DNA sequence: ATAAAATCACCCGCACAGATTTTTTAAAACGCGCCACGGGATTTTTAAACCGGTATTTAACGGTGTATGAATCCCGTTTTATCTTCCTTTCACTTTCTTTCTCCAGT
């Protein structure tokens, strides 16, 4: 949902991971930032999903 | 696989406190020498003991009114007895490197 709100679509330029992690932590997820990045990493590995 | 909490190396200038490192200086020492000083044997002089006597000067003695010495209670100081420790050391074990002995396929 946070990625959708920012307008980070599939046919546009990339965005840095730090900005997305900061938005997620500061607006929706009241937890640490390392776990969020680790979760994001797993969803982009071809050998995991 | 999601959560909670943590840790370390280096680069760039500048100012200063502390730790080696030369460098200089005053004290202690050695060798040689000479003359200042003290020992020994005469002359000389004077310090103190001794007789007086006199004229003071001190210490022992009897009342009052304190200042302090021994005793008690504490708390910082230093000694002494008492624990743990890291480097030296070998040493039996393990590991790892070097040479040798075959196999052995090919012709």
**Residues whose CB falls within 7 A of nucleic chain B?**
A 31-32, 34-36, 38-39, 42, 48
Q: Which CB contacts under 8 angstroms, 24+ apart, belong to A5-14? A: none
The alpha-helical segments, DSSP class H, found in chain A are: 2-5, 17-27, 33-42
Distance of CA A31 to the CA centre of its chain: 14
Q: Which nucleotide is nearest to A48 (CA to C1')?
A: B1
Other CB atoms closer than 10 Å to residue A29's CB: what's the count? 15
Asked whether A8 and A15 are in contact (CB, 8 A), the reply is yes
> Which technique was used to obtain these atomic coordinates?
cryo-EM
Distance of A9 CA from B50 C1′ (whole Å): 146
């Amino acid at each position: 949902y946070a990625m959708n709100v920012l307008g980070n679509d599939w046919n546009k330029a990339y965005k840095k991971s730090a900005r997305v992690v900061g938005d997620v932590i500061g607006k929706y997820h009241p937890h640490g930032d390392s776990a969020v990045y680790d979760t994001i990493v797993r969803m982009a590995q071809p050998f995991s999903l």
